[PDB]
Structure formats: structure tokens, C-alpha cells
Amino acid sequence: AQYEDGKQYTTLEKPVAGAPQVLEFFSFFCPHCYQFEEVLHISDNVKKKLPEGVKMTKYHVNFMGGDLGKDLTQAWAVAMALGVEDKVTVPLFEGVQKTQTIRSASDIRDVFINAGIKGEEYDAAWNSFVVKSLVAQQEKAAADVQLRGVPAMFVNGKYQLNPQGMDTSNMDVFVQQYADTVKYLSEK
Numbered sequence: 001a002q003y004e005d006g007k008q009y010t011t012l013e014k015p016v017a018g019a020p021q022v023l024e025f026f027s028f029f030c031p032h033c034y035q036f037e038e039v040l041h042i043s044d045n046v047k048k049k050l051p052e053g054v055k056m057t058k059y060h061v062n063f064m065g066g067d068l069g070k071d072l073t074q075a076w077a078v079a080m081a082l083g084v085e086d087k088v089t090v091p092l093f094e095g096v097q098k099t100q101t102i103r104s105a106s107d108i109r110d111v112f113i114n115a116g117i118k119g120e121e122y123d124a125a126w127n128s129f130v131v132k133s134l135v136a137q138q139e140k141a142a143a144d145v146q147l148r149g150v151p152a153m154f155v156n157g158k159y160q161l162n163p164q165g166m167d168t169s170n171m172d173v174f175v176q177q178y179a180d181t182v183k184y185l186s187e188k
């Protein structure tokens, strides 16, 4: 077959009911995740190949970066709660991996304030139980798919993308194969 179970994707032994149709896990400490976001724009190209309005979800993980990694999961919950993902993703990746200026929770906050989120608004969100529930949702989703590495993408809670075997000599062709594979999986 052109798309083979065990090759370009793997079938979860324990499917996840009610899972988002497209579910991505990442860490701001994760180098391939930085590439997937700012160099390849995987999510945006996957979105362009899927039907209008399909549910795409992106969650942060705790298992990289120790204490600051877990602060970033909570900051990503703030980003989701406020709808400012597109304003903070690049500066958070740069702060962790490029400049290494993000060393504390206060440095994470600085990124949000520089991006235009008012300090009072950030602090109210950070301390809110809406954000605690989003943190719990991110942890539970990772536990559901039994997650040990990022970046990772899961489709309809049933299939995991496997990019390892794909030709990466041309970034545009790779991104196209990735997105067409997500499309194929979503149509199964």
C-alpha cells in the first residue's frame, strides 16, 4: 500500500474516544519542535489540507526542561485561554532555544507582556482555575496516548504520524507528504 500501518503511521492499540481530530504535542525545549513550527509550519500546512473548521489541538508537555518545562505547560494553558498562541509561540521558542533568556517563570511572563498581553491579564489567567483545567487537559491527553517523545501528532485519537522514514532533502516536499498523510489518516 502507499500508506502502510507501521511505516508512515502507527495505529494506537488503545484509541482515545472524544480525542481531538488533530492532536499535536510539543515542548519549547524540543529542537525538532522548533523546526516543525517556525521553519516548516507543519500545523498551518496540515490545516490547509484539512476541511474547513476541523479541530486541531496543540498541547505542551512536562517531560523536558524540569521545573521550567512545567512552567511552560502552564504558560501554554494561559496562551490557549487567552487565544494568543500565534503571538507568543515564536518568542517562547526563541527565548528558550535561541537567546536562552527564559530562565524563570518571570521571564516567560515577560514574553507575554512584550507580545501585548497586559500584566494584570496574564496574572489573572496564570492563577485561574480555567488555566488549571487546561493544564490538567494537557497532562491527561499525553497520558492517554502514552507519550514519550515530541514532536508527536495523533489523528482522530487512533493513528500516530511517523515522519522518520520520510525524505527530508526538500523541506516543502516533506511538509507536503506529512500533510497529505494527516489528510489520509483523517479520512480513514
Ligand SMILES: Cc1cc(C(=O)Nc2ccccc2F)no1
Pocket: 024, 025, 026, 027, 032, 033, 034, 036, 037, 042, 043, 058, 089, 151, 152, 153
Ligand atoms: C507551538 C509549537 C508546536 C510545535 C510542534 O512540534 N508542532 C508539531 C508539528 C507537526 C507534528 C507534531 C507537532 F507537535 N512546536 O511548537
Ligand code: NA
Pocket: 176, 180
Ligand atoms: Na499533494
